[PDB]
């Protein structure tokens, strides 16, 4: 309520009483709809929207969008405060009490536990960063306000500050007028490091240490223990995105490296200031004397502090002073290498190794601990240690992704130019034999004179860029649409042949349901190749996509097949004695495998993680989980706690009756899904009309330029905007009804399954949440306003199934806020605006001094396109999910 | 409750580092010291000393360390308790009182506030006892303590803050507290400037915002102009070369390029974030046209040297265009200063940087006009306003540097010049000749000396400093202060030497009158200077003159010095008013009351009325820098008290002394000076007794500063000697005979003293300060030092003083109507240690001093005692 009157006061101070009154009326009508649920109100509301001027409608959509965002920040502040006035400690206590597990078991499993969070630039972040920062300032002011230690004048100053920050957010054009470059996406992603993650990681480790001491473990978490890691796809994932050129990958690698160098350099001078002790071992004494021998008695005027040669009285300052020299030259080199194509800085003057950096700091730690100064060592020096051993010389290791067909094109050009055949036409067997003979052979393959296409040269040049850059700046090479060992061996061959000194691991991505059903067989065949099993060194990573699985088949069928896939992949890896780490391509929306993280981890089959996890963070989720101190801490918290329990507390393994039951149920679910999304021939026609899917690309979120043949992100987006959520719940109705029809005691067995099998419980509960965010009257309005009089009953069929499915869900679970008002308003505005857009009549270097002049190149009516983009932004904000 | 918590914490760490035995000995010392500070039985003092004699050399070092660090913790405790007790309820009070009491209107307060300036100048005077490496640790400790003294602690946060405070105390105790080599002037300037890029830089905008809030609480919706110079910062670090030959010209170059590079770095770190904020699209036709101009010459390039915004910024967000140009010029200013400092030259084009103080300001001012015009005034009064005030307050070089030099050096230079020109000897010339010659050369157009002038190392020192001033930007400098200035010829000499060394923009010259003889005759000299029409016509109606406080109370009494200072200020204002010159007076105040220290608002109120008038300039002596800018709250309270006191002294004039009070204080001053010089100069054995009863000689062992007959000593160790022994002789000496003689001459003069203390602010402040100094004193300490270090012979001498002490104290009150335990322990340790002083890698404390002429553990223990006592009294010198 406070955010409303504040906002409306600013809106009145910027646009007059009349417009604020119109917004107020819209809120009242929307309130009567979300209250009495009379559909008449919707039309009663729509009328008020038709009269609105072209500029005024833009102001209205702006207003309800910004109020939605303010509601989000309010929610975060209230959650943080209500939580603070009162998990890791709880998880430890439960693991000790419930499962009789000892503290040293928790500590040992915790040391050998790894959580690899990889950030992606998938176009799901609706709000632009220019406005996101303002959101951060607003939640900062609100956090300082929701408190009871305000000193009057401080409250007044924070009031003026919050007012000017809201006014600043409203005075920015929220619409990206040009799509970002991949470099811009990488910048937006990495901004969360030098603001939250960089300082958040040491604090999190310290909290884990405190809990461990609350279990009786005086020992501390080893600094080199990889409890959490950060990887990135920004600038590396080039699947379907030709804008990710090789030069882009070079750009993001040199970029991240220069950011890291800058951070370390800013930290090191203060660290030198603190380490003012004089007691050290004989070891550190000898090393510091070594540095003081080649001390370079010079002016050293390029530094501000400590420009005089550091005396041996304070040896830690000697050693860390050398660390500072190598950090200054590492930063200077990375800066020149980035800006210009070259550097005169000697490589020996920098840090080239991941732990050439660590060695001196490790030595200082050993010294402090040996001389009795361990408390001092477990302070800034330990924080710095963990920062190094977590972020390294380049904050994130970069992943590369590419579809198999491009590798096949390359190899085909290679075999054709070598006059040995055509790799494409070759069977799988031939590919394996040839690739193996070339991998074990010593003769070069292609040459400088290979006829290459722009695509072929793209992939080859990416491998050359990988070869030219340091090895610790890269992660894994992920193959999209991977089906056979020949694709992996193809990437290994292309890597070695492009002279990649230290080749990075190859990892398959199984995302389509057909690939997940047959994935364990393929991975087993890959492990059958002795050369590959002997190079892989007992470690293998495989990616498991979630977006496209629930797109071609049902959501239920996709979830179940994902579970089976994980289980049998672990079975294969155990059969070959290989440590398997699985890479979960989870989204933000439940339709693409999203949901609460700990529920997603618990819903994984037991003994499939084993202290090694890898999860994607799709663009928008980055802000959701790292935009504030508290959010980031809750992130590392939820991940490590859920993983640790799933390691020591295995989820129940499904009873065989549950196996057969979910197999049949999955068959019925897939038939029910493809029945309405593929068998119905008019379905695509109805979809392109009842949802705002086509307009998604207008938001310019990402850098990426048949319903089966579309991306999963706008697929979930379309049914999310209309608040119908078809892909989330479709198959479940017919699945359940067929299971109770076949047998009546299967109702007792469904009740049995919901209360003991975590996978089933999590799935059903997610569906119930999605129903809590849905309203069929909205989709009904979109149909009535945009779907032709013809196939009106079609949607009604769906609407029937909608309610039909929901009644079943609660029947298994045993079951019988205010922001939805704004969401409804924006829904109506979107429907009417779409009706005016798909009309012929409203189809068409100066400055701009009003909203209508912000879109000069709009094919649609002056004020319409901006209003549409505003509606999509606002609805996505209210639902806290884009796609 | 706070001090006990710091104690048990510290003793727990000390036991964890050196065993139960040593902690028990510390406890015993605390108990004995408690019985002395309670019952005041002098026997206890000797009872304490015995326990100290048995102490091993290393054990004794650990003991002195222990009580010193406990004192420091007591200081931090005091600061946190003060901040919290103040926060859980001044500018608002000052405004409300100015409106209610004096009927003054808000717009008068706003106008006077706009035209008010307070110039705080930081000095590297060697009064900062604690080394910087340890001061930082103190900052971390007070941070932990502040976060602890609160009731919103989340259990695990309290435990982690416990670990942090424990490891930080252990870190401070594990550092060698003794500076083993004195710093360089550059190091002094660095220690001084560290308070900028940590507290002042972000403290100034917040302070201005608070002033805006108060003004709106008086009804003034208008805001303080961003270019209104309410506060400024100057520096002596690297410029004051009086008696310090280590301050070379290359040092001045170093500190100027240094400070400039610091400023550039700070602005560059701010500008990228400011660009992120200014995302509006509405602007005037003005900012539209300018942004289009920049976007024309936008340099469509990769621009990969920046991290953010490396693509050419589109005109849709014009503020980002303009601020982007600001960022380019800031990057090249920083690169230029960095190369100029590092090597000594730069390939960076000057046109690519900001060379003017307000070439920087112009684009930001444009952004402000735009935001205000388009209805976005709240947005402009945010980070952009903070940035504006930061620029218009700190400029391109955080502080304008003062240069100070004694007149005799300028005279040496001129004498070489006249001798080489075969026109006479400038030294032997009378004042008249100096004035006529200097004036003829100043108004002439012919060069003076040439390349072939025979110079001494001193002559080349001053001339080369002027050449360095010429080579460097003009806005990096402040004023040229002349020590021991007596005639206009001393000022004109510096004006001529400046012009002749091709100083394009010559800086203002300001005399420094510090000795009592110079203060008595200062108005006559300044009037003679204003009588010279050429100088009055170049000075442009503005003149600054410095008034030192250290040496005044050293040769004469403290009372006589204070009164003569008041008279001096008053008659200087009379002279300047008589010549239509705006006089701004430069107060060389110390930290200790003996050198003109004390509470700041009391020092400002105790100035004669109509002597500031919206223009004030006060020094901040080294130790006072940490005292007044070491934390956010400290810095804020500093700017608060300064601006509030000055504003009140402008609108609320202090009472002018009645004539009876003038004659009375003149007589009283005669008696006071006779009383002072009677015991500090007439007694020939006084120097002998002083060099034994005080640890004065050992002061230089602390290595605080870079500077290599009692009439002939520095005032700083003079106040230090009597402050350590807690006797405070220079503070109260003359007052006794003065008062007693005034009541002797007339009995109703008692009623007139009673009358004076309750109405005249100067007198009230003086007496109250003396009472504080008495509250920090104990004659039993001086008695112990005499008994232990003064020969059996002249023992009664000190007793005579011990008499006057109590007598004077009884007079003072008659007109006016916990840490000491540790301090006492350190006192006993210091006296006994001195008695042992007059008698004939490193892996433990004793090996920290390998080049000590004294016994292995003794010198370190002495330095530790001085440090600790100074910390406990919160004053060194």
From Swiss-Prot, chain A:
Swiss-Prot/TrEMBL cofactor(s): Mg(2+); Mn(2+)
Phosphoserine PTM positions read 653
Q: How is it modified after translation?
A: Enhanced activity by phosphorylation at pH 7.3 by lowering Km and sensitivity to inhibition by L-malate and L-aspartate, while enhancing activation by glucose 6-phosphate.
The Gene Ontology terms for molecular function here are: phosphoenolpyruvate carboxylase activity
Which reaction does this enzyme catalyse, per its entry? Answer: oxaloacetate + phosphate = phosphoenolpyruvate + hydrogencarbonate
Write the Enzyme Commission number(s) for this entry.
Answer: 4.1.1.31
- Recite the UniProt cofactor note for this protein: Magnesium. Can also use manganese.
What tissues harbor this protein? Expressed in all plant organs, with higher levels in roots.
Alphabetized SUPFAM superfamilies for the sequence:
Phosphoenolpyruvate/pyruvate domain (SSF51621)
Q: Name one GO biological process term.
A: cellular response to phosphate starvation
Keyword Cytoplasm assigned: yes
Q: Where, per UniProt, does this protein localize?
A: Cytoplasm
* Main localization, broad class: cytoplasm
**Inhibition and activation profile:** By light-reversible phosphorylation. Activated by inorganic phosphate (Pi) deprivation and glucose 6-phosphate. Inhibited by L-malate and L-aspartate.
Q: Which UniProt keywords apply?
A: Allosteric enzyme, Carbon dioxide fixation, Cytoplasm, Lyase, Magnesium, Manganese, Phosphoprotein, Photosynthesis
Q: Which PROSITE patterns match?
A: PEPCASE_1 (PS00781), PEPCASE_2 (PS00393)
Q: Which family does it belong to?
A: Belongs to the PEPCase type 1 family.
> NCBIfam families, per this entry?
PRK00009.1
As for what it does, the entry says: Through the carboxylation of phosphoenolpyruvate (PEP) it forms oxaloacetate, a four-carbon dicarboxylic acid source for the tricarboxylic acid cycle. Contributes probably to the adaptation to inorganic phosphate (Pi) deprivation.
Q: How does it assemble?
A: Homotetramer.
Protein name from the UniProt record:
Phosphoenolpyruvate carboxylase 1
- Organism equals Arabidopsis thaliana
Q: What is the lineage of its organism?
A: Eukaryota, Viridiplantae, Streptophyta, Embryophyta, Tracheophyta
Q: Which gene encodes it?
A: PPC1
Curated annotation (Swiss-Prot), chain B:
Which EC number applies?
4.1.1.31
Source species, domain of life: Eukaryota
- Quote the catalytic residue positions: 125, 554
- Biological process, per Gene Ontology: carbon fixation; cellular response to phosphate starvation; leaf development; photosynthesis; protein tetramerization; tricarboxylic acid cycle
Q: Which residues carry this modification: Phosphoserine?
A: 656
Q: What is known about its induction?
A: Upon inorganic phosphate (Pi) deprivation.
Record key words, sorted = Allosteric enzyme, Carbon dioxide fixation, Cytoplasm, Lyase, Magnesium, Manganese, Phosphoprotein, Photosynthesis
**Cellular location of this protein?**
Cytoplasm
How pH affects activity? Optimum pH is 8-9.
Family (UniProt): Belongs to the PEPCase type 1 family.
Name of the protein: Phosphoenolpyruvate carboxylase 1
């Amino acid at each position: 309520a406070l955010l409303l009157d504040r906002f409306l006061d600013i809106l009145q101070d910027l646009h007059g009483e009349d417009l604020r009154e119109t917004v107020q009326e819209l809120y009242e009508h929307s309130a009567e709809y979300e209250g009495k649920h009379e559909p008449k109100k919707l039309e009663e509301l729509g009328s008020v929207l038709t009269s609105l001027d072209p500029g005024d409608s833009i102001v209205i959509a702006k207003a309800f969008s910004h109020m939605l965002n303010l509601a989000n920040l309010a929610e975060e502040v209230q959650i943080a405060y209500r939580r603070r006035i009162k998990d890791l400690e709880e998880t430890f206590k439960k693991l000790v009490g419930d499962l009789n597990k000892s503290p040293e078991e928790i500590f040992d499993a915790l040391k050998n536990q790894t959580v690899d969070l990889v950030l992606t630039a998938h176009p799901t972040q609706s709000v632009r960063r220019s406005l996101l920062q303002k959101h951060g300032r607003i939640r900062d002011c609100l956090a300082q306000l929701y408190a009871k230690d305000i000193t009057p004048d401080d409250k007044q100053e924070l009031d003026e500050a919050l007012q000017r920050e809201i006014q600043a957010a409203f005075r920015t054009d929220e619409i990206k007028r040009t799509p970002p470059t991949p470099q811009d996406e990488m910048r937006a992603g990495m901004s969360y490091f030098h603001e939250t993650i960089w300082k958040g990681v040491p604090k999190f480790l310290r909290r884990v240490d405190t809990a461990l001491k609350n279990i009786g473990i005086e020992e501390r978490v080893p600094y080199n223990a990889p409890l959490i890691q950060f990887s990135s796809w920004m600038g590396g994932d080039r699947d379907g995105n030709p804008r990710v050129t090789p030069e882009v990958t070079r750009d993001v690698c040199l970029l991240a490296r220069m950011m890291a160098a800058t951070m370390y350099f800013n930290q090191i001078e203060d660290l030198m200031f603190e380490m003012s002790m004089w007691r050290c071992n004989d070891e550190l004494r000898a090393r510091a004397d070594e540095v003081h021998a080649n001390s370079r008695k010079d002016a050293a005027k390029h530094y501000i502090e400590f420009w005089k040669s550091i005396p041996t009285t304070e040896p830690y300052r000697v050693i860390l002073g050398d660390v500072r020299d190598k950090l200054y030259h590492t930063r200077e080199r990375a800066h020149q290498l980035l800006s210009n194509g070259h550097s005169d800085v000697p490589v020996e003057a920098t840090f080239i190794n991941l732990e050439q950096f660590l060695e001196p700091l490790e030595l200082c730690y050993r010294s402090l601990c040996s001389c009795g100064d361990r408390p001092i060592a477990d302070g800034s020096l330990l924080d710095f240690l963990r920062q190094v051993s977590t972020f390294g010389l380049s904050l994130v290791r970069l992943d590369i992704r590419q579809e198999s067909d491009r590798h096949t094109d390359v190899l085909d050009a290679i075999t054709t130019h070598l006059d040995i055949g055509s790799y494409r036409e070759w069977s799988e067997e031939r590919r394996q034999e040839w690739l193996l003979s070339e991998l074990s052979g010593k003769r070069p393959l292609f040459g400088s004179d290979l006829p290459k296409t722009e695509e072929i040269a793209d992939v080859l040049d990416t491998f050359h860029v990988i070869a030219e850059l340091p090895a610790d700046s890269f992660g894994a090479y992920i193959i999209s649409m991977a089906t056979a060992p020949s694709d992996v061996l193809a990437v290994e061959l292309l890597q070695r042949e492009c002279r990649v000194k230290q080749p990075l691991r190859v990892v398959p991505l199984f995302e389509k349901l057909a690939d997940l059903e047959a994935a364990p067989a393929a991975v087993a065949r890959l492990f059958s190749v002795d050369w590959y099993k002997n190079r892989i060194n007992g470690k293998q990573e495989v990616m498991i996509g979630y977006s496209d699985s629930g797109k071609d088949a049902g959501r239920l069928s996709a979830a179940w097949q994902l579970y089976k896939a994980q289980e049998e992949l672990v079975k294969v890896a155990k059969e070959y004695g290989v440590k398997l780490t699985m890479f979960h391509g989870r989204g933000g929306t439940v339709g693409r495998g999203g949901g609460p993280t700990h529920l997603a981890i618990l819903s994984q089959p037991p003994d499939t993680i084993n202290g090694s996890l890898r999860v994607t963070v799709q663009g928008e989720v980055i802000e959701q989980s790292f935009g504030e101190e508290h959010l980031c801490f809750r992130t590392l918290q939820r991940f490590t706690a859920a993983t640790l329990e799933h390691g020591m507390r295995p989820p129940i393994s499904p009873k065989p009756e549950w196996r057969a039951l979910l197999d049949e149920m999955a068959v019925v679910a897939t038939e029910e899904y493809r029945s309405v999304v593929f068998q119905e021939p008019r379905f695509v026609e109805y979809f392109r009309l009842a949802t705002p899917e086509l307009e998604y690309g207008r938001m310019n979120i990402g850098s990426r330029p048949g319903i089966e043949s579309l991306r999963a992100i706008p697929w979930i987006f379309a049914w999310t905007q209309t608040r119908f959520h078809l892909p989330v719940w479709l198959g479940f109705g017919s699945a359940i009804r067929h299971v109770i029809e076949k047998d009546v005691r299967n109702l007792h067995m469904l009740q049995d399954m919901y209360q003991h099998w975590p996978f089933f419980r999590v799935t059903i509960d997610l569906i119930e949440m999605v129903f809590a965010k849905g309203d069929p009257g909205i989709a009904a309005l979109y149909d009535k306003l945009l779907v032709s009089e013809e196939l009106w009953p079609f949607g009604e069929k769906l609407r029937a199934n909608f309610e039909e499915t929901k009644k079943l869900i609660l029947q298994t679970a045993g079951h019988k806020r205010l922001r939805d008002s704004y969401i409804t308003t924006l829904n109506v505005c979107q429907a009417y605006t779409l009706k005016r857009i798909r009309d012929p009549s409203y189809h068409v270097s100066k400055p701009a001094k009003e909203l209508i002049e912000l879109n000069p190149t709009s094919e649609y009516a002056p004020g319409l396109e901006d209003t549409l983009i505003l509606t999509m932004k606002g609805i996505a904000a209210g639902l806290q999910n884009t796609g």
